[model samples]
Target: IVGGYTCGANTVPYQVSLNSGYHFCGGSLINSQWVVSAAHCYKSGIQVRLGEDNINVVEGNEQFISASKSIVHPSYNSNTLNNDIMLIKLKSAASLNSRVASISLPTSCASAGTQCLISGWGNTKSSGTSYPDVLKCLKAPILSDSSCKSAYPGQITSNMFCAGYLEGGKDSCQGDSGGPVVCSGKLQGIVSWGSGCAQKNKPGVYTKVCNYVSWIKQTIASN
Candidate 1:
């Protein structure tokens, strides 16, 4: 899904438009080498839009990075969502500018009950219309191990972290997948799944970024 300033005839030369595009999830500018995001957002003809907003309108300042490779975690099982992590290594670093900045990944991860922030461009309410040109943010408290275990029942695993309220009404939605759930400005997790968007009694699940650190490093190195 692409939406932006919609500049005139040019339509932002740098905007990445996917043939079957998903939302532009959050990313981290780790170096001139890579930009980090969730693997679920990976797709064919994936266009990375930088510098401008609207795909229909081209602004010369924007930059485009066609993904050279998509690395989804080998252990990732869509059925249970184990190791739901991945990375995209761009052929080159996106050109830096005022509008674009890389998010930081946490060297340290927290346990249950820790508070953090999640950001995305998804629906504000379950079954509601998504934002056309804006991203949203929310604060969620990490769940205790026991609480998560109780909530998920048979689905809980060490590689997953749970967030949001049990009473629900506040959390990420369909379009929010692949975005960041940050703690103290560092990436704690990537938005992956939940029972339903912000549903009462359901929690938002995230891919544990910590477990995949070595895999991510290896993926980057091998690439």
Candidate 2:
């Protein structure tokens, strides 16, 4: 998380670290057996790390699970970044404990002006090459579709949304993809892409989870 602070250990129990052997992308545990993340975060060696705070060290609460299956939305467009969402089925269900939990999914689309939180182990600065060892968190206001459109023009689609400050200074940077955007305690969005970290008027873009609830439900049931 660019321009953020270290969060307390276990503060975000549902937060997940999607490791691709070398580094990581962020994710959210939607249930004991499912993890919701950005489709773009997919990689060959993907694994889900739950109940983690400090990524460099092992903790008693952490659950390292191999992905038995990964489902990327069929309509996802890599060129334009449409339908940038994915689901990972853990090989086994996670054991519920003080340091491990799940977050609720949104029942409806998030509205403008809603404040949301984004947490991750992404870079502290846009130009930085390294990721944070500890989880970092920051808050940003959800922008209206029209406002987001002004910044992104034709790029803002129904499947996507934006959040952050107009003046910049705080945002999810590189390595934060697939993380959750929580609003009013529900998982509203998944970090997808952006022009640059904390760039003025260029708010971070996310996959609107509510828009694909039907797909999410159907995918889980079929698999």
Candidate 3:
């Protein structure tokens, strides 16, 4: 349906489209009423769409909910791109069905070389003109912090890590920000930033979810 690998209809049920009039980013349903996404995706009047696969057409199983509130990390840096995580509270709890569910949060940091999965309706290429209508997924290998630092130099921070191919052709692009990076069936990262889509030796960077576990818990509890 889309340009990249098509997973089974709803393999990653936690995946949801973060829309503001249209699909702008991807987000993870952490629970019935909470979602985690990238802080850079912050916008006014955002909504969350669950049980969705195709962005162009609404499937019968889809459930769209207006966001009652959004929480961007207090330390979020738009310049250095550090601490790029955010939370969205749905106006009402999502109705879980066959096609909608929550993803597990990481209990620990991801290890180097671990194979992970990333999916979204982002552009298939850095130069692509259109975003995918249907969701697309791809397997990406987690690069070590040192490897990421080597590729990004001073840009890589302890709060961020990298994943994808060294040779290119399988990295998250524009519109994929805020999507999940699942490792060992747990959400280890959130798509944050990159130099370009699928560039040689330049992997897609993500916000390390494990690093923010305490913050996430506190935020949810406080709300």
Candidate 4:
């Protein structure tokens, strides 16, 4: 996050780091055995660590596990960045606790102007590089579809939505992809893509999770 506060430990239990030897991406624990993230994070031999607030510390509360399998959204368009969501089944169900838990999926679409939160262990500066060992979070508002379209010009799709200040200073960045854009504790958006971290008139574009509730449930059920 370019502009964010270091998150309190264990407060964001649903957050997961997509890592092998180190953190590369972020994801959310959707269930005991499932994680939801941006499809762009997909790779073979994927591994995740849940309930980790700091990656550098040996937090005994964290759970390190490998993905059993994953499913990319059927119509994911890499060129357009639509349907950028993905689901990964865990090799083993995580034990629920104060340090580990699943976040509820969105029941409804977030309307424009709604306040939302974005969190992850991404870089804290847009120009400079400094990946925080601790997780960071920031709050932003959902922009109107028209406004977002005006900003990106044909880049914004129905499956994608933008959120942030028009005169940007705060946003999700690299290593935060596949993380959560939460509204009232419900998962609403997945950190997918954005323009130059955070900049003027350019907002953070995210995967609209409300449109994929059926697909998420069905994909988990079938497999």
Candidate 5:
């Protein structure tokens, strides 16, 4: 896949659609029936289109699915932007393929030095313009739980995962929020925030998907 302002071949499957003027940061395919993303992306007139990059166009009958329902995780703290995850129920199931497939959930706890992939159509440089059609991706390492706890004393909770360099240049920026951070193909985190858009002394912080296994399972089961 070409790496640039447009989504690489690897990123289109996990991307989604929103109301006019809004954009997607990142997303995860939990199952044939569902796609997970950040609730902050939600606003009036939003729609989620799976398996395609252009929101204005539909790829094919089986190539994409529109959302039937959207549910944001309860108790999400906007003040800290914690618990920002949400689930989208597709109007129909998608035709699965190896290139565009559901991602695996991490069963084990994450630790420092864990390497993972993060991708998005967000800003490349801090405070820069977002990519119009392409997505960017890169590999980064996780910070130790203790190290993260000490770094962001108030906001770094167990429900969150911390990765990226403390120096911050290589971390996620705007439009990268709500994307996944995967290790060995297992989803360990969801890019949430950083001290600023890729600033020094601040790495990207993510929602620890592993820690919310029960919530995710129960949500899926009931829906």
Candidate 6:
């Protein structure tokens, strides 16, 4: 995250790190076993590292759970980054505690001004690679669809939304893709794409979560 501060232990309990050999993306624990991430982040060997704050060291609260299965949205379009969402089933249920917990999914969509928390271990610098050892977060307001469209004329879609300061002092960066955009404790968005990290008039875009509530529940029911 750019223009963010380090999150205290368990401050963002539902946040998790997506890893294979190293942390590459972020995810949100939505249930005991099911985790929400970006379809673009899906890799065959991803291990969901939960209850972790710092990915650089062995945190006693951390639990490494290999993905039992990963289901990418059938309509995900790599060309336009549309419907960039994915669900991962953990090998076993994660025990809830101070450091591990589930985030509730939102039913209604957030308004343009709704403030949300964006959390991740992505690069802090906008110009170069500098992944944070500790999880970081910043408060960003959801941008109106029209405003977002104007920012990126043909790029923003209904399946995606933007959030950040218009002047761009704070936003998600590289490696932050698949991180949570939690609004009022509900999982509202999944970091998807941006023109650049915290660039002016170029807010970070995300997968609209409310649009997939049915798909999520139905997948869990049928699978």
Tell how far residue 74 is off in model 1, in angstroms: 1.4
Provide TM-scores for the models: 0.80, 0.97, 0.96, 0.98, 0.85, 0.98
TM-score: model 2 vs. ground truth: 0.97
Q: What would you estimate as the lDDT of candidate 3? A: 0.88
lDDT of 2 by residue, 1-223 (tens): 8888788899989999998775568898988899999988877667889989888898667889989999998999999999999999999999977789999988998898999989998887866566778889999889999889999989988988899987888999888899999999999999999998998999999999999888888888888
The 10-residue segment with the lowest total lDDT in model 4: 51-60
Pairs that clash in candidate 4: none
Query: Which ranges in model 2 have alpha carbons more than 4 Å from their true place?
Result: none
lDDT of 6 at 52: 91
Runs off by more than 4 Å, candidate 3: 1-3
Ranking by lDDT: 6, 4, 2, 3, 5, 1
lDDT of 5 at 45: 44
Off by over 4 Å in 1: 1-29, 51-62
| lDDT of predicted model 5 | 0.68
Candidate that beats the other on TM-score, 2 or 5, i.e. the better one: 2
Per-residue lDDT of model 3, residues 1-223, tens digit only: 1135976667779999988888999999998999999999999899899988877775777889999999999999999989999999999999987689999888899899999989988887666566668788988889988889999989998999899878887788898899999999999999998987888888899999999999998998889
Q: What is the lDDT of candidate 2?
A: 0.88
- Global CA lDDT of candidate 6, please? 0.93
Q: For candidate 1, report its TM-score.
A: 0.80
Task: List, in order, the clash count of every candidate structure.
Answer: 14, 0, 0, 0, 7, 0
Return the lDDT, model 2, position 223.
Answer: 84
Q: Candidate 6: where is the Cα deviation over 4 Å?
A: none
Runs of candidate 5 with Cα error greater than 4 angstroms are 1-7, 11-22, 52-62, 130-132
Q: What's the true lDDT of residue 170 in model 3?
A: 76
TM-score of 4: 0.98
* Model 6 lDDT per residue over 1-223, tens place: 9999998877998999999999989999999999999999989988999999878888799989999999999999999999999999999999999779999999899889999999999989877878878889899999999999999999887889999988987999989999999998899999999998988999999999999999999998787
